[PDB]
Design a protein around this ligand. Sequence first.
Ligand SMILES: OC[C@H]1O[C@H](O[C@H]2[C@H](O)[C@@H](O)[C@@H](O)O[C@@H]2CO)[C@H](O)[C@@H](O)[C@@H]1O
Length: 480
Amino acid sequence: EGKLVIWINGDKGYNGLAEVGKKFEKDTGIKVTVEHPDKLEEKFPQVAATGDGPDIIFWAHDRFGGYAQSGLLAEITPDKAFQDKLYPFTWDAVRYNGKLIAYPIAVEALSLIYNKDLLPNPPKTWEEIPALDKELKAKGKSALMFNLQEPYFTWPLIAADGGYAFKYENGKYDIKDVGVDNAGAKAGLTFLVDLIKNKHMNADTDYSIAEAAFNKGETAMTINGPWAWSNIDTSKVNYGVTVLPTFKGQPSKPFVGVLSAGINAASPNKELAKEFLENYLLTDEGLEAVNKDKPLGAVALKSYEEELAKDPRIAATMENAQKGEIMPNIPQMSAFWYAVRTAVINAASGRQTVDEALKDAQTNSSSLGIEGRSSEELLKIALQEAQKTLQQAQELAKKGGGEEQLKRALKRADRNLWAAQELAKKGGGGEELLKQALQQAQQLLRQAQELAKKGGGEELLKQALQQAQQLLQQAQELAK
Ligand SMILES: OC[C@H]1O[C@H](O[C@H]2[C@H](O)[C@@H](O)[C@@H](O)O[C@@H]2CO)[C@H](O)[C@@H](O)[C@@H]1O
């Protein structure tokens, strides 16, 4: 009621954003706190659904259509003059059902980052990387390392030869036509899996491992976004940023995200949030402050983009963006991402073959009927009740010794979760991923009950409850 809370991902320039907040605080008297919670994309909708959460949330635009559909975002009202300050295509990215639901900040696209000293001439094709790695392994180095845990990083290769999320036709995205299991997607993922099988990459490589390896000069290349350049400048690596390699003669196609800022519909400070975003952040000085901390990439603000236009790294970011595709913002994007995430991890680990993995990804992300609609809504209600009861258990876990109360709260949450599994069970095929999420959530709740009964793991209890909430929210987004 007199303070602004902002949530932004941990890989962005939250410290630079805090500086913009200090300037706002000096002019208005409103304190601005910037936070970077883990699993932010899932945490926000969970807490905002109950009327809580930050006043402002930052994330690529793909998650915003789902937030808007759930009524978690306030309608933004920038006047014509302000709108003219940003590129029209960035505004298009934050339009849902005909209305603007967030403020665009920057255009992000993955690029190939390489060590100029280990590799003066980067590979123009993915096909030449296996031979390049064998050559570098002789020097105790590797050719390429990038996050294989988030599908965002493998998607450029998957889409290169034909893979796609939702087919765009008639001006809309057909949620029944998913392209994660066509020949193009299979070819791309098989190539990735072959790199692992042939020991050119490790299936367990995640974000931090690849970043540390590249910045320490252990690998010749990595695939990342503009936010990562800052840490590379700090290291002793002479790097270049360029176009991603082609696959079967076609450009890699990264899914392009427009980092955007939305205003929580539950915020009691909507006018102050608008003032902060329009008059403080979306100004040359404001974006400069954030950019200085962690590069934003190409920005939506025309005046500042003109100051970044001479940066070769930004030209590369723009080239890759032009070759990729702007992500859809439809509510089904969460399910798509989770489905593909599961498929890539299973195919990479060997749990499933590429064909099996992508077949399930297609079934899980793709959408008698009435009966399904009724049960779907009831399932969502059961999960919302479970999330609410759970959020209460998290409170009893913060302080106090109400072991009896916490036990009851977890049981109630558990009963509602069990009811959802029952409703999903009868749901039939197509919701296998949803069922596994609910089952995993159940395990965590049982583990939480055990911890509460033993009392020697207060922190582990909170952690188990948060992981449970995260899975329940993902389950909500998987429901169809
Ligand atoms: O990997 C799936 C994930 O991809 C995108 O998330 C990106 C985000 O856009 C970037 O700003 C940066 O934070 O890296 C993320 C990947 O770890 C989608 O925006 C997100 O919805 C999706 O789950």
